[PDB]
Amino acid sequence: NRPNRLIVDEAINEDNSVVSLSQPKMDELQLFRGDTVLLKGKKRREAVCIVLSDDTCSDEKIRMNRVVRNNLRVRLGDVISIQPCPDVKYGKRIHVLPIDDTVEGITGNLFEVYLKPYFLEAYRPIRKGDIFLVRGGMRAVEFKVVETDPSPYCIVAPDTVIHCEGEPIKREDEEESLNEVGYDDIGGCRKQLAQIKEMVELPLRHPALFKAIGVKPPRGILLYGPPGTGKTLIARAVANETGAFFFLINGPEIMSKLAGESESNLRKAFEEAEKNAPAIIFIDELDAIAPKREKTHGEVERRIVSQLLTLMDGLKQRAHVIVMAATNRPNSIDPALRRFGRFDREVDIGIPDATGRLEILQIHTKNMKLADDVDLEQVANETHGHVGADLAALCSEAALQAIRKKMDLIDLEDETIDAEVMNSLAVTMDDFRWALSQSNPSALRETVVEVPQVTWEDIGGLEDVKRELQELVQYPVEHPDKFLKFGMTPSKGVLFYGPPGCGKTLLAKAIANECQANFISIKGPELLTMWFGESEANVREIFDKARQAAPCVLFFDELDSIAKARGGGAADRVINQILTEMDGMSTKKNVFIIGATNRPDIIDPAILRPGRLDQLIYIPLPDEKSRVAILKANLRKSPVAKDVDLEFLAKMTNGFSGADLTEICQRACKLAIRESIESEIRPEIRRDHFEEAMRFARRSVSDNDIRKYEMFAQTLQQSRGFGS
């Protein structure tokens, strides 16, 4: 294994003519940043590119774009030889031709809009036969280098002339399309796409290798998540990137056919896949074929489910075939399919978080010229409850808007197309703001699972409590070894209790943020919403999701609402089931359960039993010092006048809760706003506003309440015996 041999890996630099190595390997081969390297792949093909450094890149691998990958007839994980190329000199004339299926809709000067800015100030090293991709004018066209004066390879200097005269050449049989789906078309679910890659890469990429080992590979992988999350997308991507044969089975399509045809088509699909192994059979909308057995009333329907189960069992032949399936509702699928030997591996492709949505927005703005005022991060932040498909649609909609208002001119040209103008089309931030108002988000009702953006900085006071939370949650995650030496197993869960509006919810999210661990919030009322009969499967679904997202902190907020509802046969079944789930929850799984209640007087003692929420943390009203910290936190984002004294404000609000102070800021902020409108000034919030707001300010926690809360702080653990 000489140093020149390296393994292909994902790319970070979107540039076509760029490949990356690690500094230690770049020094090993004796190459530097400016150097032009020659890459030799399989099938006796070659590609030339500029080399760069990458600290993240492992020395045994090389990052190259999918364009470079194709020019080499290579895939992820393959081996290629790299050797220095100082022999590259500037070109005299270059001849590139477009590929028919990517240019048949546009007319005009293809060279000025695409090739011009692509090679401008680029000095790209190219090779004869290479296919490169240029995106612009809401389209991506790929050209193939037909010839270069210094053949077979040369750099494109300003002196090099270009000729792109000619009817687009037709697609060669072996030349795979770059319009086809790949991993670079997927974002917002890195972790999941990784899991699938691990499961599938080995048996699909190295089939002979798996047959010799005798260890069992995966056969059934079930992707699930709301509609439009990219389940169908991932299946296609994995097939292309691994180079496996892809046979799609659409649930509805099969169920639209006669009894005999459905049975027949399923058979053929499997037979065809085995014929072209290695292969991936993807069953889209699986629930269409195999819903819960109780809902599958009908003879023809029952036969097809059984037909599928048998075919799945028939995969014991081990004909290098993987079966992937997608369903919106994991509970809808006949449980017979989730049994071992069939779909025995599941991957939850949930809804994207802020970071994810941003990743996605970037995917569908590749080909569009974006104005400077456009801020996708805002859009991402703003489009909560949006799913991949939602984002993909709004981008199309924001583009279509830019066309409409700019169509005034095009119409007179409709007869023909204005390619040169298509580039002049920019998409303003307004075009997104417009599309934002018109958006119909689908996954708002979905339970969100992501890392909270609430940090310790957002919480005033409670310093020692933050400390105790790091010991309970962070230490066992970051320092498992230490716990084993002392021979103690760490506690499973925590219970926040105290007066309303003191930061119980904030603490739950904060500790999750510190551990960069997933967070799931489920408020009392949410648990009382689930239909009575349905309640049983939903509580379980929650803990399942918590396991999927480990390390994860599961937070049961507003527990007092459920307490009031019991003393309710529904509220009883739920909490009793949560208790059951808690016990089944192994502490070793790194799932932390936190509960919060404003009413420790009516909380179910069962929840406080050792092994459950046995860590009783009291969270009181903020003392003088803390109140100042809270006031700063809320006023961080706001323009405050220098005259406003918060140390005094805190001194006057002894007994006020954290939420009360926030409300005071809001009321004082509302006064400043009022004055900004009536009299046209940049608003500032000054002493007079706080004084006026304070005169009407009221306290949410009475003295009587305090006395009671203080008493429970010393006697809450005693509620498991006889009541007080």
């Binding site: 060279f111 011009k116 000729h163």
Partner: peptide, 11 residues
Amino acid sequence: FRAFSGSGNRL
């Protein structure tokens, strides 16, 4: 069809 005929480079 073949090779060249026209112009480009610019810059």
